[PDB]
Amino acid sequence: MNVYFLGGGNMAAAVAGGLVKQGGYRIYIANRGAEKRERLEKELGVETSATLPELHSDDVLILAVKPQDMEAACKNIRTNGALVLSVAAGLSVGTLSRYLGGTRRIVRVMPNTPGKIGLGVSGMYAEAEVSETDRRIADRIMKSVGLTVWLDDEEKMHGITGISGSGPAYVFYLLDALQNAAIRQGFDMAEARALSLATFKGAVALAEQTGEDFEKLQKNVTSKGGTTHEAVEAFRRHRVAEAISEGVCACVRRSQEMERQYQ
């Protein structure tokens, strides 16, 4: 089964690479610039081209261009009833339908950048008119790069952005936060980075393996009048977790704003 990508950038290359490891797809990437077709061909060994070939109802098309270039990109594309996925932000299924001239055979994806390493999380959404078999085809495609999470309401696609879409940046911010607290305690940049990385990696593996509630895990290791308690009381006083929720709201507000730009 053919999987065409419209757009040869990072997300396209993550999912294409994903599909190559999975096996049994024919990958093909339309991308206007030669430079980056050169890379894909050398690294993944996928076919590429400046334009798409004729599509058929038995193909998949993955739309992977930046949102603002999407209407132009889709302008003269004839899907011929192919299954369409899109990974572009802020472009609703109805907007996508318009762009492509009426087809409803569309699944939306909100992936994130650890998918580049097979650790992604992809929010997924399809209207009711989209068959279960098409959902399953889309779902196995996005599972080549990580976790899928299907949503009932297209609106929750903003929640995904707020949590898993932009969340890796929050984690980088918090890694850096801990690295910097380590430098303040007298560690050189090398130790402070290693400390912070290993701290996060090991706490996260513990949470994963136990499946215990995050809060239950925090409390299990915060005896009253002890060192951990002093730190987490400071976190609480400065409303750290709350500010995290505020940041998420500001992110989801802005995703909502941005989406009104094209519908």
Ligand X SMILES: NC(=O)c1ccc[n+]([C@@H]2O[C@H](COP(=O)([O-])OP(=O)(O)OC[C@H]3O[C@@H](n4cnc5c(N)ncnc54)[C@H](OP(=O)(O)O)[C@@H]3O)[C@@H](O)[C@H]2O)c1
Contact criterion met (CB below 8 Å) for 124 and 150: yes
Q: Which of residues 72-101 bind ligand X (CB under 6 A)?
A: 73, 87-89
Contact criterion met (CB below 8 Å) for 146 and 119: yes
89 is in an annotated binding site: yes
Choices 48-56, 79-87, 128-136, 162-170; region in contact with a copy of itself by CB under 8 A: 162-170
For the bound state, the minimum distance from the C-beta of residue 77 to a copy of itself, rounded and expressed in Å, comes to 26
Give dist(CA 99, CA 255) in Å, integer. 20
Q: Is 215 in the site for a copy of itself (CB under 8 A)?
A: yes
Give dist(CA 164, CA 148) in Å, integer. 11
Q: Is 50 in the site for a copy of itself (CB under 8 A)?
A: no
Burial class (CB in 10 A: 0-12, 13-18, 19+), 157: buried
Give dist(CA 24, CA 163) in Å, integer. 32
For the bound state, the minimum distance from the C-beta of residue 64 to a copy of itself, rounded and expressed in Å, comes to 17
Choices 19-27, 60-68, 98-106, 137-145; region in contact with ligand X by CB under 6 A: 60-68
| Binds 103: which of ligand X, a copy of itself, none (CB < 5-8 Å by kind) | none
Q: Is 53 in the site for ligand X (CB under 6 A)?
A: no
**Local structure of 129: helix, strand or coil:** coil
Q: Is 39 in the site for ligand X (CB under 6 A)?
A: no
Angle (CA) 88 91 96, round 5°:
100
For the bound state, the minimum distance from the C-beta of residue 35 to a copy of itself, rounded and expressed in Å, comes to 20
Minimum CB distance to a copy of itself smaller for 137 or for 178? 178
Strand order in the sheet with 26-30: 47-49, 26-30, 2-6, 60-63, 83-86, 106-110, 120-126, 146-150
Q: Is 172 in the site for a copy of itself (CB under 8 A)?
A: yes
165 is in an annotated binding site: no
The strand pair at 83-86 and 106-110 is best described as parallel
**Local structure of 229: helix, strand or coil:** helix
* Neighbouring-strand partners of residue 48: 29
Q: Which of residues 138-197 bind ligand X (CB under 6 A)?
A: 165
Q: Is 252 in the site for a copy of itself (CB under 8 A)?
A: yes
Contact criterion met (CB below 8 Å) for 184 and 177: no
2 is in an annotated binding site: no
| Binds 57: which of a copy of itself, ligand X, none (CB < 5-8 Å by kind) | none
Q: Is 257 in the site for ligand X (CB under 6 A)?
A: no
Q: Is 184 in the site for a copy of itself (CB under 8 A)?
A: yes
Minimum CB distance to a copy of itself smaller for 1 or for 117? 117
* Neighbouring-strand partners of residue 109: 124
Annotation: binding site: 6-11, 31, 33, 36, 64-67, 89
Annotation: binding site for NADP(+): 6-11, 31, 33, 36, 64-67, 89
